[PDB]
């Protein structure tokens, strides 16, 4: 089934180039035909050269027939070069355009609502899905696919023209095919197995390495030299055998098939001479046939060598195509033209009997019903990480709940446009990763220039931008401190200036002074907008207008800090850390 | 030279591999000579000679076949041997560096040049033994033999090699000129994909995803032009090569007719001659391709060379030292990442805290007590012995230093705890845990101390990470312990417990405490203050409450 899936993958993109992809078939057919009768003409040419010689012995002919056949052969070779020119160029052009199309296709599909895929699959695996499989397809189409097609066409043509030329000699010369194909299948299969094992083992090794070469500081402090080197050496010994086998069986194929070509030309020589001396008396025709068949054997195993070599590329390519097809069948889940395009929240945000979890079984939250008002804010706290952080995931409708409703004024999240939603509501997430370019790009992530100054001042970070060289124009993509990443994220959100804001525990790794700077940044963020906040350090948002506390996704208490402390509860216990 | 320096170990297999290469080449170069001989015998009609030459030819063909397998297997043996040896040597060098020498390069740079380059050079040397040495001897042998068999055609060989050299020059220019840029662009595409993916949360948080897609599509579009250019280059050269070879063969057939008058046996040569001619064309083109690919090998070997050769910042000196007395003193120290004129002294059985401006070498001065850094000016003597005088054995077995960041390694937590002491029994293990107040927390795990830990340690949160780190620090019960703001992430419930536990194991112990939180420092007997490389003063919490101005603008918080 994998072959069919990969073929469908290719088809989906190659459809848009049908006429050219069909014309190249005629081009290659003509090219192979011309390249396949060339040995016939060179053989006839040497035959006529022998005839010219024997005439020179007594007659001294005008070599007119020889000259004519050389004319034919030279013209055919030139036109062969022309055919190669044309189909190579056209194939390259179509491959380039198709590769661009499918690369943009993978990207576009990625930026659909496949949020669940990223949520479940580890980052490394999904990045691999791209950088290994699609790049393998790219390499295959760049160099692999044309080789196999050209070579198989050459193979069929040369077989047909052998049988048109001679019967017994060709029926014998191809007799080496079963041995060669057995060699190829065995070696390539064992190479696949052993190289996969080698890749696994070297992955384990380089993972051990990566981790040690990252933590070496503690090693130096405590002198773990001997133990770490011993473990590295043991894994190195394992990969020693692994890579020995893998490398040998990977590199064996090409020389093995070359030697097979040697023995093939040898055996065809043997039968050619035997037929020539013991068979037809017309030695001139005999030797012409012999040299012709030598050329044929070379041009026959060249396809076999090329296809066998490209087998490794193409098989892995089609497996990667299977993976990309699995991706391409993932539901986009984009919302339709739902009509409603929110322009202003109206300041009546709330939740209604919300039940949700990563998957329907064992929901992490149940019956969540909270409301928020004009420029108001709500403080949240409960079980660490999941169980409380998840509610935000629904607030942006990253996921969609099975049942229960959330709205900003009556209208449920399912109603309005996703784009308008994301535009009108901002989110700040713990890690707060950055992007390529300059800090100006990261703040803009927008069609705004001077608003960055106001935002950075509001983000209490402007001093830090001006501190660096060329200020906002400082390229970045490392070399940047921790809290300032979150500060940049806050600045980004405020320049977005959405109606509603949601923030997590922004004080994950920061000092008290940076914490206070983050706090005044919060004040700036909340001062003008309604906002939710997830807080584990209660001191951060002690001045919350209203406070919510969660059991494992169930609201258990609510109210003001003073209300929630004069009212005995889990909130007071948590506060009692101070 | 480094590759051969290492391969001296496998020269024994290298020689046999090269001999295998040689035999393969000589067989492949004779078989067309024997082709000429046999079809010449057909011309001369010697049945017994025909049979003898045929059997010789098939035998030599099989000999070349087996030469192929032996060549590849032993070339692989040498290649893997050199790769393993060089990776091991580099790993040893890395582990023998000083922390500064490690800082000379980024961890990503270390890992990439340690894993990608090593395999790149392994594959390169594989191709080198299996292929490279084949091309030059193949080329010269084909040249000389073809000259021998058809001397009158000597010039056409020169013409063909000239033409192929011309087109190969065009390639060696344009293809590289475009290969560098397309490699950079393909790397750029993967980089932007990485950045977008990890940010998918924020990217989808904004409609800017559409513009990000437009940017990615633009970049791919520039990639398209270069890809089309290189495709055109293929479509020009490959037809160009095939055309030149075919034209040379046909010209060989055509011009030989001008000399057959006085010698017809040249009919016998012509076929083997064209075979040799195609052979030499293929040999030169593949040699050019492999020479071009050799540039990456050159870059990789250059990159690995410097890391291999670089010497450390710290060195052994003279004799192993006595047991550390337990005192620490500074003598007008200076350092550049930074520090200058630093001086202070603390005696056995005392506690002191350090505080300074954020980012103003948050922990570097403390990091200097470990010899991983060296005082550029001045000196420090710990226990009355200078850093230049002490040897690493005593430092580790008498001093410890919790890093500014928590670090864990794959496997079990028990081994990571054992990092501090090789033979720390379990009993000492839970003693350290209780000192860090982790016994119950660890008990909550699947097994406990032997429970597993992720490679990145993502199955535990930051607080218990700090706790594990401090346990590792205290397991050895060293005379000197350095505590660096380990309380700045966990819950504000166990800082009192950890400081209290330190306040009972303090016997015969002196510790340095670093943090921006004076709260954890108030329990310190003494305190030192620093500001951007300048020592502010020495004293105590209450005394500095009025003595120095820097105290107040942190104390108010």
């Amino acid at each position, epitope marked *: 089934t994998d072959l069919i899936k990969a073929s469908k993958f290719f088809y989906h993109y190659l459809k848009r180039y049908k006429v050219s992809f069909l014309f190249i078939f005629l081009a290659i057919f003509a090219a192979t035909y011309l390249q396949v009768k060339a040995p016939q003409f060179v053989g006839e040419a040497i035959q006529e050269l022998a005839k010219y010689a*024997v005439n020179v*012995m*007594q007659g001294k002919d005008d070599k007119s027939a020889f000259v004519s056949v050389i004319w034919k052969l030279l013209i055919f070779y030139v036109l062969t070069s022309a055919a190669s020119f044309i189909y190579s160029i056209l194939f390259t052009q179509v491959v380039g355009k198709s590769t661009n199309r499918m690369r943009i296709g993978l990207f576009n599909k990625l930026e659909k609502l496949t949020i669940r895929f990223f949520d479940s699959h580890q980052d490394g695996e999904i990045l691999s899905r791209f950088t290994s499989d699609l790049d393998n397809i790219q390499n295959s189409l760049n160099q692999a696919l044309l080789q196999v097609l050209t070579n198989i066409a050459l193979l069929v043509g040369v077989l047909i023209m052998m049988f048109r030329q001679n019967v017994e000699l060709a029926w014998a010369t191809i007799a080496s095919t079963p041995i060669a194909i057995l060699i190829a299948v065995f070696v390539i299969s064992k190479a696949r197995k052993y190289v996969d094992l080698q890749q696994d083992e070297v992955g384990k090794l380089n993972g051990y390495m990566d981790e040690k070469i990252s933590g070496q500081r503690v090693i130096i402090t405590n002198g773990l030299q001997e133990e770490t080197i011993d473990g590295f050496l043991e894994q190195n010994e394992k990969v020693r055998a692994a890579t020995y086998k893998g490398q040998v069986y990977s590199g064996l194929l090409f020389p093995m098939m070359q030697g097979m070509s040697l023995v093939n030309t040898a055996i065809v020589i043997f039968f050619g001479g035997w037929l020539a001396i013991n068979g037809s008396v*017309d*030695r001139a025709a005999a030797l012409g046939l012999v040299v012709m068949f030598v050329q044929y054997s070379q041009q026959y195993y060249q396809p076999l060598m090329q296809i066998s070599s490209g087998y490794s590329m193409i098989q892995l390519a089609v497996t990667g195509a299977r993976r990309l097809n699995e991706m391409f069948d993932e539901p986009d889940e984009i919302r339709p033209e739902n009509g409603e395009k929110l322009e202003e929240i109206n300041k009546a945000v709330a939740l209604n009997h919300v039940v949700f979890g990563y998957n329907p079984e064992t929901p992490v939250l149940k019956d969540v019903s909270i409301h928020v008002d004009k420029g108001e804010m709500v403080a949240l706290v409960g079980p660490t990480g999941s169980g409380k952080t998840t509610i935000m995931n629904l607030m942006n409708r990253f996921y969609d709940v099975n049942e229960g409703a959330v709205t900003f004024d009556g209208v449920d999240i399912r109603e309005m446009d996703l784009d308008s939603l994301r535009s009108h509501v901002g989110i700040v997430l713990q890690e707060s990763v950055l992007f390529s370019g300059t800090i100006r790009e990261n703040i803009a992530f927008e069609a705004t220039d001077e608003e960055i100054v106001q935002a950075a001042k509001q983000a209490n970070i402007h001093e830090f931008i001006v501190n660096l060289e060329q200020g906002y124009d400082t390229e970045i993509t490392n070399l940047f401190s921790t809290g300032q990443k979150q500060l940049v994220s806050i600045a980004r959100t405020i320049i977005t200036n959405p109606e509603l804001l949601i923030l997590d525990e922004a004080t994950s790794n920061v000092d008290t002074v940076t914490e206070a700077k983050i706090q005044k940044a919060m004040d700036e963020a909340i001062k003008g907008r309604t906002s939710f906040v997830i807080a584990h350090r209660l001191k951060t948002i002690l001045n919350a207008d209203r406070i919510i506390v969660l059991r494992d996704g169930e609201v258990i208490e609510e109210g003001n800090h003073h209300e929630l402390v004069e009212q005995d509860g889990f909130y007071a216990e948590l506060y009692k850390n101070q | 030279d480094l590759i051969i320096q290492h391969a001296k170990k496998y020269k024994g297999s290298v020689v046999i591999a090269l001999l295998a290469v040689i035999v393969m080449v000589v067989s492949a170069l004779w078989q067309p000579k024997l082709l000429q001989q046999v079809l010449e015998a057909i*011309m*001369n*009609d*010697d049945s017994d000679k025909m049979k003898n030459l045929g059997i010789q030819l098939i035998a030599i063909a099989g000999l070349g076949l087996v030469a192929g397998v032996i060549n590849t297997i032993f070339s692989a043996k040498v290649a893997q041997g050199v790769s393993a040896d060089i990776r091991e040597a580099t790993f040893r060098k890395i582990q023998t560096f000083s922390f500064g020498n490690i800082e000379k390069f980024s961890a990503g740079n270390l890992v990439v040049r340690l894993t990608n380059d090593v395999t790149q050079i392994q594959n390169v040397i594989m191709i080198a033994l299996q292929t490279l040495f084949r091309i030059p001897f193949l080329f010269i042998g084909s040249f000389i033999l073809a000259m021998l068999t058809l001397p009158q055609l000597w010039w056409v060989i020169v013409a063909l090699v000239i033409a192929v050299i011309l087109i190969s020059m065009l390639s060696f220019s344009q293809m590289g000129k475009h290969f560098m840029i397309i490699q950079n662009l393909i790397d750029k595409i993967n980089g932007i994909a990485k950045e977008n993916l990890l940010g998918i949360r924020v990217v989808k948080s904004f409609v800017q995803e559409k513009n990000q897609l437009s940017r990615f599509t633009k970049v791919s579009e520039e990639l398209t032009t270069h890809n089309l250019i290189v495709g055109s280059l293929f479509a020009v050269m490959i037809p160009a090569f095939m055309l030149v070879a075919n034209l040379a063969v046909v010209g060989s057939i055509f011009f030989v007719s001008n000399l057959v008058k006085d010698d017809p046996t040249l009919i016998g040569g012509v076929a083997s001659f064209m075979n040799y001619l195609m052979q030499i064309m293929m040999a030169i083109i593949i040699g050019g391709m492999m020479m071009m690919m050799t540039s990456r090998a050159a870059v990789s070997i250059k990159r690995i060379k410097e890391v291999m050769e670089t010497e450390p910042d710290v060195t052994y000196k003279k004799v192993p030292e006595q047991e550390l007395i337990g005192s620490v003193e500074f003598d007008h120290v200076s350092f550049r990442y930074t520090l200058k004129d630093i001086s202070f002294s603390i005696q056995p059985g005392e506690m002191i805290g350090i505080v300074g401006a954020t980012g103003a070498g948050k922990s570097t001065l403390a990091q200097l007590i470990p010899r991983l850094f060296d005082p550029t000016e001045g000196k420090i003597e710990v226990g009355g012995v200078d850093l230049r005088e002490v040897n690493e054995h005593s430092l580790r077995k008498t001093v410890s230093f919790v890093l500014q960041k928590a670090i864990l390694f794959s496997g079990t937590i028990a081994q990571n705890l054992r990092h501090g002491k090789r033979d720390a029994s379990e009993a000492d293990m839970e003693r350290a845990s209780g000192i860090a107040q982790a016994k119950e927390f660890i008990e909550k795990l699947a097994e406990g101390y032997d429970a597993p830990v992720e490679e990145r340690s993502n199955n535990f949160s930051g607080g218990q990470k700090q706790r594990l780190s401090i346990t590792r620090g205290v397991i050895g019960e060293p005379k000197i312990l350095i505590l660096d703001d380990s309380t700045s992430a966990l819950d504000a419930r166990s800082e009192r417990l950890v400081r209290e536990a330190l306040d009972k194991e303090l016997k015969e112990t002196t510790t340095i405490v670093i943090a921006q939180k004076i709260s954890s420092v108030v329990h310190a007997d003494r305190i030192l203050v620093l500001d951007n490389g300048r020592l502010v003063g020495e004293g105590t919490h209450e005394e500095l409450a009025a003595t120095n101005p820097v105290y107040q603008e942190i104390y108010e918080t």
Partner: nanobody
Framework: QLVESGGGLVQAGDTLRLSCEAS?????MGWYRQAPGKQRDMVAH???????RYADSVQGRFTISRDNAKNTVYLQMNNLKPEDTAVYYC????????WGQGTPVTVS
């Protein structure tokens, strides 16, 4: 082209050395014969190197020789019998069988 001399009247039991020369041509040579009314048929062959092969009818009696210095060939008739009477030719060729005019020998 070729040239052969030596043939003539002989008796059953006589000895005659045939001698043929090539027009600057270097070849594997051999002698053929034609009995009156019979087809051209092989008699013996001498390889360019120097080794040879004879027809059973003449095996053990007739001897062939050549001189590579000039590509001349010889064949020693000896112990003749009446059936040996025929016209003989010297042959040396590459593809098309070059043969000389040949000469007759009559075994009386």
């Amino acid at each position: 082209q070729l040239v052969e001399s030596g043939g003539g009247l002989v008796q059953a039991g006589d000895t005659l050395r045939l001698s043929c020369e090539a027009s600057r041509s270097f070849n594997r040579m051999g002698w053929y014969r034609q009995a009156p009314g019979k087809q051209r048929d092989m008699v013996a062959h001498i390889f360019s190197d120097g080794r040879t092969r004879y027809a059973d009818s003449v095996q053990g009696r007739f001897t062939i020789s050549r001189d590579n210095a000039k590509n001349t060939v010889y064949l020693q008739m000896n112990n003749l019998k009446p059936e040996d009477t025929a016209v003989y030719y010297c042959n040396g060729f590459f593809i098309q069988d070059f043969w000389g005019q040949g000469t007759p020998v009559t075994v009386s």
